[PDB]
């Protein structure tokens, strides 16, 4: 359509539609309790995402926010899923490690605080806070890849497994930051249709193909 | 008032209010953990319709959405009323089955995404997309339902009760659809106090009635 | 800034942001699952506080609602707080007491009801109605602490420290009505500036201050 970034809004929606049936399709069977629990976790999240990235495509998860005298286009609805899928993820790897609920609800709760400090910032008209927003929602983020670190006698299947998704989570997680500061929510250096390649390119690695290599392990079985 | 589907509005308040006060009272000297499971569950359903009902009388849940050259009413406040009843309609069922979470976590965000597709449906303004997000919303249903019947050695009173409330379910839950979409929010076929009539019926049955089925049986003493 | 409340809102997010600091700083080395528990909800109350407090400060959790022939700020941010807050605190007082899930589902369903209904009672634009809102919310305050007394062979350690915060939550807690009523958001009595700091004092008096009782105990470690 008329905004360049439509073909990754297009390409994203796609590909976390085709995930969702991937890991819907492969649940088929699953009476394992615990492979119940990873399987509704990760199934959801690009269940969510391709709603969300859907809403983003048909233009309804969009909206103007003046500053910097000109008219930005944010999309909110990446955290109206970000809100649900990083709690979803955090939760896939924390049951994985058995985390008692004290690690669990910082987790989550840190987590809620990022995507929703990340929202406030997004929306605000006042260009400087914008990026005090931004620190405040990196030092959650900081802090619960420390949790993810040196918050936490497991089963060698689920460390190795946990090994694996806790870099491919910061190494992933780590970069948003980065792209919100120099795209259109921050700075305005990276043009807005290359934002959202490299959210797309992040989004689907970090919940389908964070989901391929938890699925793919028998880490989640009991 | 000057809304013709006030009288609608009006009754499903009133209903919704004696059918939690109904509740509330029953409650009362239950001591049995869980009978105090579904107490709480069943007597919040319409303790928050009731406060969601009133919310649509007295106008606040109602916003204008343009579209078909129109400008249409559209009660929003249903779906915060949705998004926090049906869940918990749900769960009350789950419980009552002793569905371990992984199926709880799969009906309860299956839940969130036919509610949370329905909203952005009810406030989309283009008139086509209007249907996309419907049809979303109606395959979120449509899993949940199958999860009713094939996601699930119970006692002889929770399966008799059990299928009393499924086939309840299914039966009410399955006219949202359709009547949105012959609704103001589709095609504009039925009038708005009509749909307001039909919601209100099918409300007042999916909760109250629904709860008295539910409270009146042994079923949920363990 | 422009605003006379604005001293208020500052000290506010700077008390607020020192307590959690405080509190994060001294869960520095739990190990003990439950008092992990505790650590976790109650740092997260004046962390989430603090977030809300700073948004009002910098001008983003406030908006003009039109009644009374006038324009009134209203600062929506208060419940966004609240809303995840004070189920927070009554999860600290349930855990504490060792509540069965039908109690902790009630308070904090009820709670969501009271800030909800309290958040629609800010925002409707018929002056009258405002006061239906409030009513409703205060009889799911009144029915809290209800459960809070009458709702509940604990350890006398858990007993004494829930007696004390009980007793200090009912205090703090059945003042926000009060402040409410006669403040911008209904009658206008008690000017914008004044309210501000009352819900200052009692806000860090009811996270902070009943932060440092609780955590300041043995009552929560298991
Ligand atoms: C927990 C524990 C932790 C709590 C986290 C603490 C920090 C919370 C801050 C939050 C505050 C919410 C921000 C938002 C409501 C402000 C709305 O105003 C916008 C900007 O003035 C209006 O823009 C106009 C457009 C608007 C766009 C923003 C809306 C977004 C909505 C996303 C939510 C989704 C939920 C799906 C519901 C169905
Ligand atoms: C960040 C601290 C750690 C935490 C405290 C949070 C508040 C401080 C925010 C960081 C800085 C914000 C100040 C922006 C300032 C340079 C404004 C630039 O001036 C230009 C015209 O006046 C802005 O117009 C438009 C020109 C623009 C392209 C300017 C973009 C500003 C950039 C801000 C980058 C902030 C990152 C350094 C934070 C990494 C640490
Ligand atoms: C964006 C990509 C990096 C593109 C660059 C590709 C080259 C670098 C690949 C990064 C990967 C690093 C992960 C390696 C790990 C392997 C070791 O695992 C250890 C097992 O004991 C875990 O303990 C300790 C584990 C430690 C691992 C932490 C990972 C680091 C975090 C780096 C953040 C990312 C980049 C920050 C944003 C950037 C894109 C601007
Ligand atoms: C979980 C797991 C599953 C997550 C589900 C995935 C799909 C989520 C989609 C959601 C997106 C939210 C839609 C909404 C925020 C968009 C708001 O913009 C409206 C239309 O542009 C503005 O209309 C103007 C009026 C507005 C009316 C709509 C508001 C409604 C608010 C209802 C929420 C209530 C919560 C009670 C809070 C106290
Ligand atoms: C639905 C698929 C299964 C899933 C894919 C989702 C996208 C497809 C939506 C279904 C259709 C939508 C197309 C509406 C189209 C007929 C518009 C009608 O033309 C009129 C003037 O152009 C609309 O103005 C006003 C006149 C109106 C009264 C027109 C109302 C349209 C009706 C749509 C009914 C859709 C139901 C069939 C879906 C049941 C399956
Ligand atoms: C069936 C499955 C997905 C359906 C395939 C899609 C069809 C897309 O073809 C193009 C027709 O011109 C839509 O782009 C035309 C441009 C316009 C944008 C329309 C894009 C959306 C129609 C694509 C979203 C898929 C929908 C999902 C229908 C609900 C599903 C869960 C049953
Ligand atoms: C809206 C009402 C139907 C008004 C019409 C009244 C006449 C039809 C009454 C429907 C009722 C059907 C329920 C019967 C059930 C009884 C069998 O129970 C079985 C026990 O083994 C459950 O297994 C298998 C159970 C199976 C039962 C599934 C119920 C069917 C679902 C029908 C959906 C509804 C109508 C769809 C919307 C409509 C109102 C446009
Ligand atoms: C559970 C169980 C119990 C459920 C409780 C039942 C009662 C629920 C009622 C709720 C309804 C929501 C009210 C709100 C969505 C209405 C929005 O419209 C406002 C006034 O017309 C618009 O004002 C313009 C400004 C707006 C300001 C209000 C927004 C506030 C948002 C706070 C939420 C935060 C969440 C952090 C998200 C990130
Ligand atoms: C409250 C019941 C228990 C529950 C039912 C809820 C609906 C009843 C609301 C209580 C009352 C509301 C009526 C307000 C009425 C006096 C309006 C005052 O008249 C003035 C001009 O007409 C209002 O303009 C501006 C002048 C203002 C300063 C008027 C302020 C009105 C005050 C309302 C105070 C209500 C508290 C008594 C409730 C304590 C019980
Ligand atoms: C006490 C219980 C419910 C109170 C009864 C109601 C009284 C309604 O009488 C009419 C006075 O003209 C209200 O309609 C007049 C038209 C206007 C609409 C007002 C309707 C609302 C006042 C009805 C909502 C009930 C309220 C609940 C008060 C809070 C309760 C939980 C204590
Ligand atoms: C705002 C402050 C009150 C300022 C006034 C200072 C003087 C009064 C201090 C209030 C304090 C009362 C708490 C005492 C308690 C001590 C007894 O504990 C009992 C142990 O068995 C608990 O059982 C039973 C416990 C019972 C205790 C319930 C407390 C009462 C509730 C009072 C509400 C507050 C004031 C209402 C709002 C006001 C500020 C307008
Ligand atoms: C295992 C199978 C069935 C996978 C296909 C399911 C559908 C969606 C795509 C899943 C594949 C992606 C791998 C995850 C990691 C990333 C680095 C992908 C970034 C996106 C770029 C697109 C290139 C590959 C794809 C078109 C599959
Ligand atoms: C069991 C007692 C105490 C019930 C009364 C509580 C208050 C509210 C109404 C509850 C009754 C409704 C039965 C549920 C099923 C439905 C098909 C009702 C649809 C609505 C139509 C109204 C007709 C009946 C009523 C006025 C009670
Ligand atoms: C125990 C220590 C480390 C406390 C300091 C942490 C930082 C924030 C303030 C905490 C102290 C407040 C006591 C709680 C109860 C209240 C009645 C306070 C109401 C607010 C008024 C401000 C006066 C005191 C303070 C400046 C500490
Ligand atoms: C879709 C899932 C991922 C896993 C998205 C994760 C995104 C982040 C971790 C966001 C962090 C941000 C921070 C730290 C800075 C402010 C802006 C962001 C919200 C993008
Ligand atoms: C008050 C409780 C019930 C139990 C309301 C349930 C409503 C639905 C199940 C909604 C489904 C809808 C779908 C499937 C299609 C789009 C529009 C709706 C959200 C009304
Ligand atoms: C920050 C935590 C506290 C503990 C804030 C609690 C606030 C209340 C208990 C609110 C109740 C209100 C009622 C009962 C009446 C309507 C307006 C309020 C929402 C302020």
Redesign the interface.
């Given at each position: 359509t008329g905004r360049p970034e439509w073909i990754w809004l297009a390409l994203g929606t796609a590909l976390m539609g085709l995930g969702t049936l991937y890991f819907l399709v492969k649940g088929m069977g699953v009476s394992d309790?615990?492979?119940?629990?990873f399987?509704?976790?990760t199934?959801?999240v690009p269940?969510?995402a391709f709603?969300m990235y859907?809403?983003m495509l048909?233009?309804?998860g969009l909206t103007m926010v003046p500053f910097g005298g000109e008219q930005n286009p944010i999309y909110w609805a990446r955290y109206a899923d970000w809100l649900?899928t990083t709690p979803l993820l955090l939760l896939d790897l924390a049951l994985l490690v058995d985390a008692?609920?004290?690690?669990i609800?910082?987790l989550v709760?840190?987590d809620?605080?990022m995507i929703?400090?990340g929202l406030?910032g997004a929306?605000?008209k006042?260009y400087s806070?914008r990026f005090?927003w931004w620190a405040?929602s990196t030092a959650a983020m900081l802090y619960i890849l420390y949790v993810l670190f040196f918050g936490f006698s497991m089963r060698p299947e689920v460390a190795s497994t946990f090994k694996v998704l806790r870099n491919v989570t910061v190494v992933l997680w780590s970069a948003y930051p980065v792209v919100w500061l120099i795209g259109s929510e921050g700075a305005g250096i990276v043009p807005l249709n290359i934002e959202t390649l490299l959210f797309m390119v992040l989004d689907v690695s970090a919940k389908v193909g964070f989901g391929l290599i938890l699925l793919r392990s028998r880490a989640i079985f009991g």
């Open positions: 309790p615990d492979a119940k629990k399987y509704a976790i199934t959801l269940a969510i709603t859907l809403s048909l233009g309804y649900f008692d609920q004290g690690t609800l910082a709760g840190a809620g605080i929703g400090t406030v929306l605000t006042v806070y005090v405040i």
